[PDB]
Design a protein around this ligand. Structure first.
Ligand SMILES: *[C@@H]1O[C@H](CO)[C@@H](O)[C@H](O)[C@H]1NC(C)=O
Ligand SMILES: *[C@@H]1O[C@H](CO)[C@@H](O)[C@H](O)[C@H]1NC(C)=O
Ligand SMILES: *[C@@H]1O[C@H](CO)[C@@H](O)[C@H](O)[C@H]1NC(C)=O
Ligand SMILES: *[C@@H]1O[C@H](CO)[C@@H](O)[C@H](O)[C@H]1NC(C)=O
Ligand SMILES: *[C@@H]1O[C@H](CO)[C@@H](O)[C@H](O)[C@H]1NC(C)=O
Ligand SMILES: *[C@@H]1O[C@H](CO)[C@@H](O)[C@H](O)[C@H]1NC(C)=O
Lengths: 197, 49
């Protein structure tokens, strides 16, 4: 199964304040109108993952990111529980039935939840946005940028990932975007410079 | 010197709506025109003397 990503999956490329300006940047972004698979198998991570879900029952518990996903290698486990999120890295049909070096605990995260997962420069970078939508079978149109949620300096190899329990999965590509910042420094629009002439 | 960032100028209160993660803004010459004070988390505008 497959749907249309439209103009979703754009996130703030850095942490610098800008306003009333068109800024040109090159980074790993979800290409506009890219084919986004609509979904529980283990999936490739490739160069980064666009993830979104529309569960009204708080089904998505979290995610597993790693390679072999077994006792041979360090892997990242992100699990959401009541009023908390727990993130750990250890030598770890999961769903509670799912050498530790990373311990992190912070705040938890019709209701469309959008996430971007990157694994670059030793950082597992998570971007996130939460908005209401009026559709169930597809992703909404219009534009909304994802602010960074957490920067995790866990220096591990990720090639595959799995979702802990509908959801959508896309992949990021090296693309150039022209981003439009409004008077409050919010990215309100964008152009995918390689979409068409 | 703000958290390692140096320069010369007049500091005033900023009215820029920085997001919770942003520490400084940049101009078209890639100069810094605003910073987040590392102790008070106050946003300050930088206007050259
Ligand atoms: C997405 O993939 C599906 C299934 O292969 C195909 O039917 C559809 O045309 C594709 N859409 C786009 C936008 O590439
Ligand atoms: C943890 O590291 C030690 C190496 O001293 C290894 O023997 C042990 O099996 C590792 N844990 C797992 C689950 O492999
Ligand atoms: C969520 O899980 C963590 C495990 O680190 C635990 O410490 C915390 O108390 C749990 N929260 C609740 C409400 O049970
Ligand atoms: C991650 O593991 C895979 C195993 O198939 C390997 O091919 C790849 O080069 C490794 N990447 C890094 C950065 O270690
Ligand atoms: C965001 O920009 C709009 C102008 O479109 C303005 O009316 C609104 O007050 C701004 N938000 C804040 C917090 O200043
Ligand atoms: C750090 O500095 C900030 C800003 O002046 C102040 O609000 C805060 O109380 C200070 N904290 C400590 C631990 O000294």
């Amino acid at each position: 199964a497959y749907t249309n990503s439209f103009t979703r999956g754009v996130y703030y490329p850095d942490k610098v304040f800008r306003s009333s300006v068109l800024h040109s940047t090159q980074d790993l972004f979800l290409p506009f109108f890219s084919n986004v698979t609509w979904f529980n198998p283990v999936l490739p991570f490739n160069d980064g993952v666009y993830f979104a879900s529309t569960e009204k029952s708080n089904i998505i518990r979290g995610w597993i990111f790693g390679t072999t996903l077994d006792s041979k290698t360090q892997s990242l486990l992100i699990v959401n529980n009541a009023t908390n999120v727990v993130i750990k890295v250890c030598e770890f049909d999961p769903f509670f039935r799912v050498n530790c070096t990373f311990e992190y605990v912070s705040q938890p995260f019709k209701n469309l939840r959008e996430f971007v997962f990157k694994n670059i420069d030793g950082y597992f970078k998570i971007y996130s946005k939460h908005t209401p939508i009026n559709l169930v079978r597809d992703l909404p149109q219009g534009f909304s940028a994802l602010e960074p949620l957490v920067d995790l300096p866990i220096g591990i190899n990720i090639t595959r990932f799995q979702t802990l329990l509908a959801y959508y999965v896309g992949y990021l590509q090296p693309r150039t975007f022209l981003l439009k910042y409004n008077e409050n420094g919010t990215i309100t629009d964008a152009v995918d410079c390689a979409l068409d002439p | 010197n703000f958290n390692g960032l140096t320069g010369t100028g007049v500091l005033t209160e900023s009215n820029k709506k920085f997001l919770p993660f942003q520490q400084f803004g940049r101009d078209i010459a890639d100069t810094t025109d605003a910073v987040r004070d590392p102790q008070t988390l106050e946003i300050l505008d930088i206007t050259p003397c």
